[PDB]
C-alpha cells in the first residue's frame, strides 16, 4: 500500500517518490540529496512547513497521496 509524494526543490523541479506508510523518510531525503549531489543534511525537508526527521514516516505525519514536501537549503549562521 503505497502513496506517491511530490518533492519540490528550490528551483521548482519535482521528483516523485512512491513510499509505504511505514517507510522511514530518511530514505526519501537521502535519495533526493543523492540525485542533487549534496549531503542529505545540507538540506531541510518540510511538510506543511515542519521539518521531516529521519525516522518520521508518512503515517506519523498523516501524509496522503500527492502530498507535497518542500526542500530548502539548510539555514546558516
Amino acid at each position: 500500500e503505497y502513496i506517491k509524494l511530490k518533492v519540490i526543490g528550490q528551483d521548482s523541479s519535482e521528483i516523485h517518490f512512491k513510499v509505504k506508510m511505514t517507510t522511514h523518510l530518511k530514505k526519501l531525503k537521502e535519495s533526493y540529496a543523492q540525485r542533487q549531489g549534496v549531503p542529505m543534511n545540507s538540506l531541510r525537508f518540510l511538510f506543511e512547513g515542519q521539518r521531516i526527521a529521519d525516522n518520521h514516516t508518512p503515517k506519523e505525519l498523516g501524509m496522503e497521496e500527492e502530498d507535497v514536501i518542500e526542500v530548502y537549503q539548510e539555514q546558516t549562521g
Binding site: 503505497y2 523541479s13 521528483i15 517518490f17 512512491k18 509505504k20 535519495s31
Partner: peptide
C-alpha cells in the same frame, strides 16, 4: 523535464 518517480 520528464516525470521522475522513484520507488522506495
Amino acid at each position: 523535464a520528464e516525470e521522475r518517480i522513484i520507488v522506495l
